[model samples]
Target: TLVVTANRFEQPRSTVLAPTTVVTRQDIDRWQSTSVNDVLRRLPGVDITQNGGSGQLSSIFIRGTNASHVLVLIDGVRLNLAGVSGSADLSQFPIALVQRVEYIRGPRSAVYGSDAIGGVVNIITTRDEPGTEISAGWGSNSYQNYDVSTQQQLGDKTRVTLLGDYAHTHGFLSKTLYGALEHNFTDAWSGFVRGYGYDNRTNDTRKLYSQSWDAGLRYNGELIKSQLITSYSHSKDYNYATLDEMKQYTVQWANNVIVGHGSIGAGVDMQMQMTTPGTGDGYDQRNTGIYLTGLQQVGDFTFEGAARSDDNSQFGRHGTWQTSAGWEFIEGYRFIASYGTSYKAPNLGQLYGFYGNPNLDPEKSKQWEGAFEGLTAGVNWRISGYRNDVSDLIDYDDHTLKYYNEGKARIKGVEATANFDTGPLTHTVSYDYVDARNAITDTPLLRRAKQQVKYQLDWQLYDFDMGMTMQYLGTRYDKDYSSYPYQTVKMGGVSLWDLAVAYPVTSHLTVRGKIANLFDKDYETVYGYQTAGREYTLSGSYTF
Candidate 1:
C-alpha cells in the first residue's frame, strides 16, 4: 500500500500500528464514484451524513469522532480552512482529479498537529502518466459531468500533468452547481488550482464558492532532501441571504537528512486567515508552528518520534508530541505500539463569530495504542485498539450566545482489516467497535455508531472487471430537536450495497457502469436530512 502520509515515503502497510486504507486510481475507476464521500463510505468505521443528494453537504465521521476532528489534506495542503470549524465538505471534492487517497484513522495529531485527533485523509493529485483522457456521464436527477486530463514528459528532468472536471445536478430537493477545477504538476515543482461551488436555492437558497491554489518546490539529493510549499484557499457563502467570506494563506518548508541508518526532519509553518462580517466587522487570525521528527531502523525494530510547537493568535501556544516503536516477531508477524498528544485551537468562527467568545481554550487529546499484524493462511490482516482522551472541548450556549470549554470525552475503539484471495476472487473485510462517550455523562457521542462492518469483492471475468461493496452500520443515538428539553432518539441500523462493472475496449479506452444504494434503502445518519435513493451512472473514458 502507498504510505507517504505516515512516514513521508513509500513503505509497507504492515509497518504502521495505526490502521490505514489506500484507495488508488484503479479503485476510483472501479467504483465510478461521483464524490469523495462515495469513495469513503465503503470503509469500515467511517460514517457519513448527506444532507440531500449530490453536491449537498456531506459530513464524515471517522471511528465515532466528530466531523471536525478528522483532518483533510490535498497534496499535503490542509483543505479545511484554519479559521473555520475545521470541517471539510467531501461533497464538493470530485474524484476525477484524485490519483490516490491515503486514509489513516485514529489519533494522528502527534505528527500532523491539530484537527488530526481522529484521522487524516490525504488526497494526492494525479501525476503525469504520458497520455490523455476525456470522460463524461449522465446520471439520475439530471446530473451531468465532463472531465479531461493529459500528461507528458518535458525532456528527461520534468514531467507535467493537467486535469480538471465539472459536474451539475438538478437535485431532487436542491439544485447544485459545480465548475472547472484543476491540478498541475511537474518534477521539482508542482501546483494545483481547485475551484468548486454549489447553489442549493430550492430550499435554503444556499450558494457557496471555494477556490484553492498551491505551489511547491523540492530537491531530492542522495542523502538530503527538502521541499517548500505556499498555498491559499478562499471560500464565500450566502448565509440567510447575507454574504460572508473566508480567506486563508499559508507557507511551509521542510527538510529531511539521512544519516547512520536513520532520518531526521524539521519543518516550519505560517498561516493567516480572516472571515468577512457576519455582524458588524470581520476578524482575522494568524498561526505559526515548528516541528521536528526522527525515524530510526535498528535490527528488526523501527522507532519514530515527532514534536511540534504551535502558536495561534487567539489560543496562544501549544505543544504536542508522538513516539512509536515497531518490531517484527516472526515471519509474517509484528507488534507495534504508539502514544501521542494533540491539541485543536478554537476556530475563528467558533471563537469570534456571532457567538464569539474572547476566551476559549484549545481542545486537547492524548492517545495510546498497541497493535499486531499477522498472516493467517494467505490472509494479510491487522488489528489495533486505542483510547483517546480529549479535554477542553468547546460547547456553545444558545441563551448566552457564548462558547465555553465543555467536559471531557473518551474514545475507545478496536479496528481490524483483512485482505486475501480465495480462488480467482479477492476479498477484503473490516470491522470496528468504538466505545466513544462523554467522560462525565457516560453518553455515547451524538451520531456515532458503535458497530460497523465493511466488505468488498473483486473478480475479473475475461476482459470485463467487476466489484461489489457492502456495509452495515449499527443503531445509534441522536438528539431530536424541534421540541422542548431535547430528547435522545435512536436511529436504526442500515445496510448498503454498491456494484461496479468495467470493460476495457482497447489499450487506452474503457467503459464503466455503477449502481449505488442497490436496494433503494432509505437511511439517515443524521436527523431530518434525506439521502439519495437508487442511482445509476455510465461513463466512457479514452486515453492516448
Candidate 2:
C-alpha cells in the first residue's frame, strides 16, 4: 500500500518510518460499516468513547492520549474546529463518501503542527470509481439507510463524482452530500475541487450542520512536485434555544524536491478560526506555520527528520521536531526507533468562552517509541512500545470556575499486530496494553481501558464470502459527576462479536448481511450511557 499520511508524500508503506494502518473501501464494504468510527474501533492502539448510540457525541483516544491530541483530516483538509472541545466528531463522517483511511499512530507535529501529539487520521474521498452505484439497508432500532454514488468522465480530460446518503434511526437522522471535480489542464498540471457536508439531528433536541469546500492545484514535475490549496470549513450546532458555531479558513502550499538519494519536503500553512457561542462573546485566532522534512536511505539503513515552527496569535510561537531511524540487520527483519516533541495550542472556546481563561498555556508533549516488524514464517507481525510525557494540560477547575493549565500525565503502551492465513482462512489479531496515569497523583486516566484485543477471521466457502470479528475490552475507570463530589467508578469488561456475509446474485448486483453484537452484548464505553444491543442490517448493491 502507498500512504501519504506518514510523510506528507506518497511512499510505500514498508519504507515509511511511522507505524501506520490503511483501510480501503473493500474493507468497509466487507465490514458493513455505516460510519467512519465503525471502521476505526478495531484498529491497533485505538479506543473510542461514545455518549449513547450512533449520531451522538463520539471521541477517539489514541495510545492513551487525550481525544483533543489527535487530529483528523479529510482529503488533506483539517476537520478539527476551534469549537466547544477542540475535537472532531468521528460520528459525523459516513463511509459512503470515503475511499480510503490512513492512520498513523504517533506524533506528527513536525509535519502537521498542532493536534497531532497522539496520531493522525486522514480520510481520502472516493475518486477512482466510475459508473453509478446504489445501496439500501435496514437494521435494528428502526434503522434505515440509502446511499447513491455516480462518477462520469467528461471529454477525456475531466471527471466529476457525486454522492448522497441518508440514514435514520429511532431518534437520530443523518444526511450527507458530496461532490468532486477533477481536471487535467496539461500533462504535468492538474486541478481539483471538492465540497462535502453533513446535517444531523440527535434525540430531537440537538442538531448539527457542517460544510466544507476546498480547491487545489497540483504540479507533478520530474524534479519538483508541488500542491497549493485554499479551503473553508464551518460547523454549527443547535440545542433547544442555544447555538454554537465555528469557521475555519486555511491556505497551504507544499512541495517535494527530489535529490540524489533522498527527498526534501517543505510547506507553509496559514489558518484563521472564528467561533460564536450562544451566550458568550465571540472569539477568533490565527496561525501561520512553516515546516521542513528530509528522508534518506543508504543500503540497509534509513534516516528521517522533520522540524516545524508555528506562530499563533494567542500563544506566540512554538516549535516541534521529530527524528527516526530504521535498520535492517537480517534478510526480512527491521527495527525502527523514533522520538518527537509536540504541542497543542489552546482553542478559541477555551481561551475566551464561558469559564475560559486567557492565561492558559499550550499543552506540550514528548514521546519516544521503538518497534520490530517483519515477515516471520507465514505471518506478518509487528510489536511496538512507546512512552509519552505530557505537561501543561488544560483542564477545568471547579474551584476557580475557569480553565487552567496545571495538569501533567505519563502514558506508556505496547501494541502488537499479526496477520496470517491457515489453509483458506485469513486471520488478523491485534492487542494493546496501556498504562496511563496522572504524574502527580498516580491515578488512572478516565475511560481508557488497560487492555484490549481484537481478532478477525475471513474465509470464502464456495461462492459466499464470510467474516467474523471479536473485540474484548478490559476494565476501566470513569468519574461520576452527578454527586456533590465526583466519585470514581469502575466499569466492567465486555466482549462483542460481529458477523458478515456477502454473495453475488448477478453480474450487476450483490447482497450483504451483517449482525453486530452477535450475542446481544450490552456495554458502555462511557459512564452513564447505554450502548446498542444486538443489531442486524441487510443490504443490496447494484452497479451499472
Candidate 3:
C-alpha cells in the first residue's frame, strides 16, 4: 500500500503513477525462500539468469535493458557498486533479512537518476517484529541455512532490532545481519543507523568466499531529513585457477527539506574503488558528485524532476536530468507517463584495468514510458509500454582486445500484471514482451527473452498453505563467447513448475517444503551454463 521507490516520500501506490510491485515478508517466508532471487524471479516483468547455482552471480533485466541499467537500494543506500559500473550482487542479498521489496518497472530517471534507466528495486529491512524468531534448514546439494532475529522497544519512543543469518551450500553467501536503532527524541527529531552484509561458504574460490558490511547514521526532523552513510564492501574471486579482488568504499550525505505540496532534496557524495585484477595489475580510483531534486503534487497530478552532475577525477563532468507526470484521471483508474535521460559512469575495471580502454565513454540513455493501472472488484491490474535507447554502451572490442564504448542499444517492451483473490484462493498472472536490439549492429541483443510469463495460484485453509508457480522464458538467443568461430545460438523456451507447502505444527513452530524444477526439465538461460536441476527443500522455524 505504501510506495517508497516510486516517490522519494511514502505515498499510496495507487496515487504514485508508476507501475509497481510490492513483495511482502509474509509472501517471502510463506514460500520459505532464503535468497532474493527466488522472490524476484516470480515478480512480473523481471528476467533473471544465474550463471551457476544459488550463490552464483545472477544477471537481471527489467523489461529489456542491461543488467546495470537497474538501480538497487538497501534501506535507502545505493547498493549498486560503482566499482563495477552500477552492478549489484543479487545472490548475496538474502530474503531472510529483508522485510519487503519495492519494485518499479520503468525508467525512473525523473526521480532516481543514473542506473534507474531500467527501473528501481528497493530492499526494505525488517524493523517491526517484536520478540524473537529462529530458523534453520538443509536441502539438496548440501544446502544449509540458519537465521535468528530479535527486537525490543525501549521506553515509548525508541525501538531496536537485530538479525543474523548464515547460509552455505557447497558455495554460498548478510547485510541486515542488520542491527538498527530508531528513536524519536521529540515529535519530529529522529533518525536511525544500520549495518548489514554476508559471509558465505563454498567449495571453489571464484565462487569464492566473500563478506561485505556497511553502516550509516541518519537524522529526521520537523523541517529536514538527512543521512550520513559510509560503506566498505570487499569481494574476491579465485576460480578455474586465478585470483582477483574488488574493494569499494563510499561516503554519502543526502538531505531534503519538506515544503508545501512536495519536497526539495540535495545530495553530495564521494565514491572510491580498488580493483586487483591480479597482482601488480590493479588500480584505485575515486569520483565525486552533486545532485538536486524537486517533487510536487497538485490537483489530479504529480510532477517529479531531478538533475545531477557527476565529476570524475579522470573524465571531467557529465550532467543529466529527467521529468515525469502522474495523473489520476478517475478514481481507481489512472494514466502515467515519463520521459527521462540518464547515464552510468564507466567503472575502473572497464576503463583502466585488464581488458579496459581509457578511451571508452560513459553509457547514456534516453527513455520514456506510458502506462495504466486499475483496481476494482476483487482484482488489481496494470499494463505498460516503454521505449529506451542507450548509447556509448560498454562492450568487448575485438579490434583492440579491450573494452570499448562504441556500442548502442535500443530496447522496447510491454508488461502486464493482475491478481484476483477470493476467500482462501488467489490467482495471479504476469506477462512480458520485449524487443531488444543492438542499434549499431542492427541485431538482437543476446540472452534477452522476447516473451515471458508467470502464473501463480495459492490457497490457505486451517493451518496449511500451498502455492504453485509456473515460469516461462521464451526464445532466447546467446553467443558462444568461448569459441572464435562462434555465433549466436537459439535457446528454446522452458516452462518450469515449482511448488511450496507449509503447516503449523504448534502455535510457535512451523514446517515447510519446496519442490523446484517440478518436472525435471533441463534448460539454459545462457548458451552452455549448467542450470540447477530437480531440487527439493524441507525446513522449519520457531517463534518465542
Candidate 4:
C-alpha cells in the first residue's frame, strides 16, 4: 500500500477527517494545462483569482478563506513568502514538472502551524525516470512554450535529475506579453536546488512587472529508526512597482515514526522576510514555529493530537492546537471529528497596502469540524461540517481606503463531494455552503457567497479523452459603505466547458488540440474584472 501523511500521522485516506483531492500527471497531460492554477480552478470549493496576463499574479481561496489562509508546500518545504503580503503567487509554478498534487480541505494549522487555516497544497516532482525529454508548442494568442528535462542514475546508489522550462505569450490585450523560466535539480541524499524567473508587462489598468528566484536544499535519512527530514529555501521577488519587492528565507526540519500503536512526529520552522513598498521604506519581520503531532490506531479506530506555537516579531507569540479521531465501525463506512485553532498575521499588502498602517495585529480564530465518508458499489462520497469563531478580523473602511480590526466574526460551513466511475466514464459533483457574518452588527461578510457547487464529467475512447465542467456561485452581499446598509449583488456563476482531442502520430510524437470556454459563458468572480472568453489552442509534443 502507498504511504500517506497529512492526516495526524500517516494514515490512509480511508481514515482521514478532512476531504482530499489528488491529481496525477496523467490528468495534467490529458487536460493539456500549462499552469497549476488552471488545473486547481476545476477543483471543488476552490477559486482562482487572477490579476493580469500569463505569468501574472494569481490568488487562491478555499471555503471562503483569504488567500493567505492557504499554505503551499513543495517537496515538504513551506512556500509561504515572508513579506507583509504573506502570500505566494501561484502563477509561477510550472505544470510541466509536477508529478502529483495533493489537496486537503479543512483547517490544518494544528499540524502545519500558522497560515494553514484553509488547507494545504503539496506539489511533488517526478524523479524515478532516467532519460531526457523535450516538448515544444505554439498556440493561438501568440502563446509559445518549450520544456526539457533530463534524469540520470549515477550507478545504483546515486541519481540526479534536472529540468528547464520557458513560456512566452503575447496575450489577448495590450501590454500583456509575458515569459518565465524555471530550473530545478535533484540528487541522491535528498539535496535539491530550484530557481525561477518571470518577466511580464500588464495592461495600463495596472502596470506590472516582476522577476523572482528560489533555491532550496534538503537531506533525508534514518535516525534511530525514525525518518528524519530537514530542508532550507531562499526565495526573492522583485516587482518593478514600489512596495512590491520581497525577499524571504525559510528553514524547517521534521521527524516521524510509530511507537507502540501510535505514530509520533514533530518539526520546527523559522522564516524571515524583508519588504519595501512604494512610498515608505519597509522593515523586516521574523517568525518562528514548532509543532508536535501523534496518531494512534486500534482495531478499526484511529485518534490524533497536535499542538503548535508561533512567535512573531510584531505580534509577540501565540499558540494553537487540536485533537481529532476517526472510527471505521463497519466496512465502507467511517466517522471523523476534529477541533483546532488558527491565526493569520496581516500581510504587508494589507498592513501597508494602498494606505499604510503599522499598528495592525494578527487575526485569530477557533475552528471545529466533523465528517463522514464511505464507498458504495462504484461511488465514493464524503460530507463535512465546520465552524469558525474569529477575533480581530480586518476589513477595508471604504471611505478612508484604510484597514482596521473589525471586532469579532463568525463563519460556518458544510462541504461535500461525490465521485463515480463506471467503465470508461467518470463523474464528480461537489458543493460548499458558508454562513459568514459580523458578530457586532450581525451583517453578512462582503464578497462571500452562501452557496457554491461544481460538477465535472469525463469520458475516454482509445487515445482520445473529453471533459466538461460547470461552476455555480450563489448571490453574495457587497458592502461598499458608500451604499445604504448593504447591497445584494447577484454575481451570476459560469458554466465553462472544454473539448480536447489528442492523437499519437507516432511512438515519440503526439498532437493535441483544445477549445476552452466552449460555451463562452461570461462571468466574473470579482467586480470590474472580466474572465477569459472563448479561446482555442493547438499544440504538439515529441519525446526522446
Candidate 5:
C-alpha cells in the first residue's frame, strides 16, 4: 500500500512512522457509503457526532482531542473554517468526489502548521479514470440522492474530471460540485487546478454556501521534487437572524531532495484568514511558517524527524517538532515510538466575535505514542497506546461573559484493530478505550465516549455481496443547559447494527440496499440532539 498523509509525500506504508489508516474507493463502494462521515466512523480511535440525520452538522474527534485540533485537507488544501473554531464540517463534502482518504492519528505540526495538534485527515479527490457513471437513491425520512461523475482525456497532455452530487432529507438539502484539470508540460513538469462548491439549506432557518479553488505546479526530477500551490476559499452562513462570512487565501511551496540513505524536505506556508460575524466587527489575521523534515532507513530500522517555526500576526512566534523511530524486530512484527509537540491558534470567532476574548492564548499540547503491529497467518493486527497533555484550553465563562484560556486537559487512549478471513468470510474488528478529562477538575469531557467497539463481516453468498456491521458506544457525559444553571447528564451506552447487500443486475448496472440501525437502537452522542432511528436506503449505479 502507498500512503501520503503521514509524511506529505507518497511512500510505501512500511516506511511511514506515524499511525495511519487508508480507505480506498473500492471500500466506499463495498460499504455503500453516501457521505464522508460514513467512511470515518469505524476507524480505530475515531469518534463522530451528529446533531440529527442526513445533511446535519457533524464533528469528528481523533483520540479524544478537540474537533478543532484535527486538520482536514482536500487534495492537500486545508479545509478548516476561520470562524467555526477551526473545525471543518464533515457533512459538507460529497462522497462521489472522494477517491481515497488518509487519516494520520497523531500530531503533525512539524509538516502542517496549526490545527494539527490532534491529527490530519487528507481527502484525495477523484482523478482521471476515463469513465462516466450515474447513480440515484432513495431512503427513509423522505431522503433522495443523486450523483454524476465523468472523466475524459483531452489529447495526450491534458485530462479533466468532474463530479456533482445532490442529496435531500426531510427538512434539509445539499448540493456539491467538484472539478479537476491537469496537464503535463513535459516528462518532469506538470500543472493542475481544482475547484469545489457546496450549497446547503434546512427548514430550520439555516443556510450555508462554500466554494474553493486551488492551482499548483509540480516538478519531478531525478534528484529533487517540488510543488507550489495557491488557493482561495470562502464560506457564508445564515442562521435565523444572523449572517456570517469567512474567507481565506493561502500560498504554499514544498520540496523534497533525495539524500544518500534518506530524503530531506523543506517547505514554506503562508495564509490569511478574514471573518465577518453577524454582529461583531470584521477581523483578519496572517500566519507564516517554515519547516524541515528528514526520513532515513537503515536495515530494518527507520528514523524520522521534523521541526517547524510559525509566526502569527496576533500571537508572535512559536516552535514545534516531532521525532519517531521504528524497528522491525522479527519478520513481520514492527515496533514504533513517537513524540511530538503541537499548537492550535485561536480562531477569528473565538478571538474577536461575540463574547470573544482578545487575550486568549493558543492551545499547546505534547504527546507520545507507542505501537506494535504485525501480519501473521493471513491476519493483520495492530495495538497502540498514547497520552497527550494540553494546556491553556480556551473555554467560555458565564460569569465573565467571555472566552478565556483558563483550563487544561489530559487525554490517554488505547486503540486496537484486527483483520482476518476464515471460510470465505472476511472479519474486521476494532476497539477503542479513551480517557479524556479536565486536568483541574478531574472530570470527564463532554460528549466523549470512554469505550467503543466495532465489528464488520463481509462475504459472497450465492453470488450476492453481503455485509453486516455492529457498533458499540459506551456511556458518556454531556451538559443540559435548558435551565438557569447547566446540569451534568449521563448518557447510557448503546449498540447499533447495519446490514448491506449488493447485486450486479447487468454488465453495466449494480443495485445496493442498506438497512441502518437495524434494531432501532436509541442513543445520543450529544445532549438535546435527536438520533436517527431505523432507516433504509436503496440505490443503483450505471456505467457508460
Candidate 6:
C-alpha cells in the first residue's frame, strides 16, 4: 500500500515534511546505473556536476539549491524547461526505463511549485506487464545497451504494453558521444516516446550540441468513487553553438479520491513554447495552470491543502499556495508543518540569451517547513527544517554576460536521513546544512555550498551483490565577475568512493561490475575544473 501526497496527506514515511529518498526496484538492481547522473550521485544531499561523460551536460544540487532549484518530475509531468540553464537535463533521461525514484530534500517551496525551490525529484516509469522481455548489455567506454518488452491481455477488461530502449556511449572524454531512444505504451491508456542525442567536446576549447524529443499521452478514468487523469506532452530541443531551438506543448488534467476517507485533487495545465531568435527572429510563449489538492483525517490528525494559478504570456499572472499539518502524538512518532508560495519564469535562454533581456520579470518565493519522522530499531528516520524568502532573483552577470534581476534572497536549511536493515546488510545516511544569503547585498549565494554528506553500503551473498559509497562536499563562495574582490573560491572538500559487483550469470543472465573514483580522488566543482579520475565498468544483462 503505497500512498504519498508529496508528504502532506496520503501520509507515510512515518509522516513527512521533507527528507525522503527512495530508489527501489531493488535499488535499481543494485546500482547498475548508467546515467541519470549515475543514480543521482548515490543520493544524500545530491551534488552532481558534470560537463563531460555519460551523455554529457549535467548539473544537480539539492541542499545547495540552484540547479534550476531542483525540480524534476515524470509521472506527474513538469520536467523543467522555461528554456534551460542550470538543471533539468539529466541527459534526457533513460536509465533503462526506470521504474522508481523519489527524492525530496528541503525547501519544497511549500509543496512543489516553481522548481520546488530546490527539492523534489520524482520519476516513475516502467509499467504494463504481461509477457515478453529481452535485454542486452556491453560495457567499458564503448558501452551499449538494448531492451525490449511486450505485454498483452486485451481480453478480460483489456491491457496492453510495449517498451523499447537503446543506449550507446563512446565517452570517457574527448568529444563524448551518447545516444538514447525510448518508447512506451500501457493500457487503460498510457503512452510515451523519447529520443535524445548528445555530442560533446571539452578539455577546454569547448563545443557542445544537443537534441531532444519527447511525447506523451495518458488517460485513466473512473468517477463517483473518484479517479481521473489525462495528460499530454510534446517537446523538442536543439542546440548548437548559439543556434538554439525549442518547441514545447503540454496539457494535463487530474482528479483522484477513489476509495478514501478524505482525499481530493485537481489539475489543469497548458503550455506552449517556441523559440529561436538570435537576430534570426522567432518567438512564442504561453502558459496556463490551475491546481488544487486536499486531504484530511482527524483522529491522529492530518491535513493538507494546495492551490495554484498561473498564466503567462511574458509574465502576466501568477499565484501559488500551500498548507500542511500532521501529528501522531507518539507511537513511532511524527510531527510536521508546512507553508508556501512560489513562482519562477524567464528562461528562453533567460529571456533570449547571448546578451538577452526583453524586460524580465518573474521570480518570487516564500517558504517554511518543519518535520520529524520515525521508526527505530530497524532504523528509518528523517528530520527537516527549512525557510526561504526571495524576490525578483535571477542571475548570471558573469562580467556582463547579461541577465540580472537580483533583489532579495535568503535560505536556510537542515535535512537528515537514515536507513538500515539487517540480514543481507544495508545502510544509508545523509546530511545537509545550508545558509544562503544575499538579502540585498548581505552576500553569500553564488554556487552555494555549506555542507553535505552521504554514505551507503549494501551486501548480499549467495549469488553475490555488493556495494559501498561515500561522498562529502563542501566549501563555497565564488563570484569572479571578472576580478575585483569577488574570489573566495575554496572548494577542497571532497571524498568519493565506490565499488560494486553483481553476478547471476544464469537463469536469464546478469553480470555487472563498477569502480568509480575508488581511491583516485582529485576534485573540483569548477575553477580550473577537474573530476573523474578513476573509473571502470563491465556489464551484462538478459531476461526473456
lDDT of 2 at 290: 95
Off by over 4 Å in 2: 277-280
How well does candidate 4 score on lDDT at residue 65?
72
Ranking by TM-score: 2, 5, 1, 3, 4, 6
Q: Write the per-residue lDDT of candidate 5 for residues 1-544, one digit (tens) a residue.
A: 8887766666777778877788998788878887788899878788888887666788888899887788888776788365455677777666777799998888998888888977788988855468899999999879899999888887678888888999888788889898889899999999988898888887767888888888999998888989898999988878878887878899999998889677899999899888774522667789999999899998889899889999999887889999999999999999999999999998666787677778777899999999999999989998999999999888897797899888999999898999999988999999999999998999998788899999999999876999999999888887888785898988887998999999987776999999999998877887787888788989999999
The CA-based lDDT of model 3 is what?
0.76
Cα TM-score of candidate 3: 0.90
Candidate No. with top lDDT: 2
Question: What local distance difference test score does each model get?
Answer: 0.75, 0.87, 0.76, 0.66, 0.85, 0.64
Question: What does candidate 3's lDDT look like per residue over 1-544, in tens digits?
Answer: 9776764556576655567889888888777776788888888777888886776778888878887877887754566355243476677566666788999866665445456777788988855778889988888878877888888887677888888887777655432366777777677566565555555444445444344556665576776877777777766655667655767777888788877787788878677777775622676767777877777888888887777777776666777777779888998877888777877767666776668778666799888888887888968888888888999888887877799778899988898889999778898999999999999888988778999999999998777889889889899888887898788888888999999999989788899999989998998777777888788999988999
The TM-score measured for candidate 5 stands at 0.96
Q: Can you give the TM-score per candidate against the true fold?
A: 0.92, 0.97, 0.90, 0.85, 0.96, 0.32
What would the C-alpha RMSD of candidate 4 be, to one decimal place?
A: 4.5
Give the C-alpha miss distance for residue 168 in model 1, angstroms: 1.5
The numbered model that scores best in TM-score is 2
Mind giving the per-residue lDDT tens digits that candidate 4 earns over 1-544?
1224373234566545567787887677777887788788777667766654455567777776767777787654566354325675667555665778778776677666667776778776644656777776676667787777777655454455666666666642211111222222333134434443334343332333333333333332332122233343333343344435555566666666667676677877677776664522676778888888777888888787778888888777888887788888799888998887888787666776676466777787788888888888878898988887888777777787788887787778898889998778788888888787777898876566578888877886777667666667776654333466745665655556777677777677778777777887776555556676677878777777
Q: Which stretches of candidate 3 lie above 4 Å from their native place?
A: 83-86, 109-113, 153-159, 171-178, 207-217, 221-223, 236-243, 276-282, 480-484
**lDDT leaderboard ranking:** 2, 5, 3, 1, 4, 6
Error of 6 at 57 (Å): 9.2
Error of 6 at 498 (Å): 18
When summed lDDT is taken over every stretch of 10 residues in candidate 5, the lowest stretch is 275-284
Q: Model 2: per-residue lDDT, tens digit, 32-54?
A: 99877788988988889898888
Q: lDDT tens string, model 6, 49-154?
A: 6655665567787765566767787654556344444248666566755667777654443334456765678876544445666766666556666666665654
How high is the lDDT of residue 133 in model 5? 91
Pitting candidate 4 against candidate 5, the one with the higher TM-score is 5
Q: Show where candidate 4 strays beyond 4 Å.
A: 1-11, 51-57, 172-190, 199-243, 277-280, 349-359, 396-404, 476-488
TM-score of 6: 0.32
Q: How many clashing residue pairs are found in candidate 2?
A: 0
